[PDB]
Symmetry: C2
Subunit: 303 residues, 2 copies
């Protein structure tokens, strides 16, 4: 990268700045074999995969991308409908990025916001995917449908960060380090930062220290309250199911299981889905790296 | 800070939980007015004079708000539950010899008010609540649309110190954004600038902001459970009641306010006022006449 004091958490992996019509996508690229794209979420960057990507690179050509607007990827200017940070637009952009590498059909694993890009990609463009894995999420529509007093208090940030600009931007900008560390710790099993490599945390903190990066994150959640929700509602009410073979992995103490049985939910959205919990909080690839890596290796390797 | 209550004195009223500050004016039957979030007693400055033409008007800062003392909170946020606040204000009124009085409240103060009516109806001759539904009714309506509309009910109720830390960055911005965004105009032009300064100065103290978060923590937990018991018991406020709400306020957002209150009260009348949330400042003339006519009748 271009940040002198941030650590290289993928020894041996190359680096790519991939041009697209919507801006550059940064990625680390390693391994060889069938192509597998990995997508991080909030409030993280591509380095969240640093503990599982080497194991995956033993069997796949692994592409670890920063989401549009996150990490070192470019930050398109948003609009009144939060368009570039909708999962539909993010998926189109990452499809464009993968074509630049010559990948028109690939395997895909996503976590948190990246998992939302991933199932939206499967709904809009299923021919692009051989197999899909989503980590510690339910569909955005399903989160909102479960909204009640208990859900609103337990996962408040969906409604907070979706408030009109500049309300979340100005609240997060007073003490950004405290917020990003608080969010990282609060979703782990133990409720502290012990699950994370401190060098990865510094990546997350430096990203969050940029007000333009924080604005993108709020736009992500604004799309998640509005367009993404409207997009999802159209699919579930039409009975559209993802046909791509799918794996749902969630943490036993994560977000997706808060008030739902995740595999039953995903069977409503996908016609060929398997799933398993893992004893972990929300951050599966850092809290339970070996079990996550093995589940992904076995799923993506299965004939 | 400006004096916005001509002809009103200023009183510090002792209670077992700390002092209650109040402006006091007028003569005649006693009437207590209770403000809400993020304001102080000065929010009544445009209607209290007309009320003081007929009543002894007592304009109090809520426990922990404005210039009233801040009792220490606990793990169930007890002193800032509306049941506790009502008890403390009942004590303050007894210091003045008022054991039967009329009551009007707005926002948090309206929640103190209907809880007071449910707990101790003998204290009230009449009750007015401005731009609210019962706390239980907000939470039962907390779907996607409402969670986005009143996000602060969940945000300010997050465990300390998350909202405290975020509010400390730019407190002037937050109090001004809450005031502006709930009015019809969406700016601060409906408020007297001197009144806004009162609100800003109070919000500038981290101890006052913590109390407000404890208030919203009570609203998500104990207050909700207290309301739920009354719902399950079929309890209705027997005190004659007035529900005023802004046509573009919060109470009307996801519900029909008079239909809701008639499930909570056996003798309630009401009307919308063309106004956002802050009835006594956005629409002082219509609010004052409605209140005068109700508390005289
Ligand atoms: Cl480098
Ligand atoms: Cl998410
Ligand atoms: Cl979820
Ligand atoms: Cl309120």
């Amino acid at each position: 990268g271009h940040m002198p004091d941030l650590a290289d958490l993928f020894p041996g992996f190359g680096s790519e700045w991939i041009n697209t019509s919507s801006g550059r996508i940064f990625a680390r690229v390693g391994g060889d074999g069938p192509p597998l794209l990995l997508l991080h979420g909030f409030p993280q960057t591509h380095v969240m995969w640093h503990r599982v990507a080497p194991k995956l690179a033993e069997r796949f050509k692994v592409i670890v991308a920063d989401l549009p607007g996150y990490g070192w990827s470019d930050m398109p200017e948003s609009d009144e409908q939060h368009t570039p940070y909708t999962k539909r637009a993010m998926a189109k952009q990452l499809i464009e990025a993968m074509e630049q590498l010559g990948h028109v059909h690939f395997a895909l694993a996503g976590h948190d916001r990246g998992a939302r890009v991933s199932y939206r990609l499967a709904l809009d463009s299923p021919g692009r995917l051989s197999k899909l894995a989503v980590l510690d999420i339910l569909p955005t529509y399903e989160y909102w449908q479960r909204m009640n007093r208990a859900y609103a208090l337990k996962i408040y940030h969906w409604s907070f960060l979706a408030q009109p600009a500049p309300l979340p931007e100005n609240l997060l900008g007073g003490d950004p380090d405290f917020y990003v560390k608080a969010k990282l710790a609060s979703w782990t099993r133990a409720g502290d930062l012990s699950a994370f490599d401190p060098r990865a945390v510094e990546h997350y903190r430096i990203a969050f220290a940029d007000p333009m990066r924080r604005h993108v994150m709020c736009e992500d959640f604004r799309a998640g309250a509005y367009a993404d929700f409207e997009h999802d509602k159209i699919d579930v009410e039409a009975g559209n199911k993802i046909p791509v073979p799918m794996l749902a992995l969630w943490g036993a103490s994560g977000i997706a299981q808060s008030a739902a049985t995740p595999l039953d939910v995903w069977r409503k959205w996908a016609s060929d889905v398997q799933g398993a919990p893992i004893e972990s909080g929300h951050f599966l690839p850092e809290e339970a790296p070996d079990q996550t890596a093995e589940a992904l290796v076995r799923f993506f390797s299965a004939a």
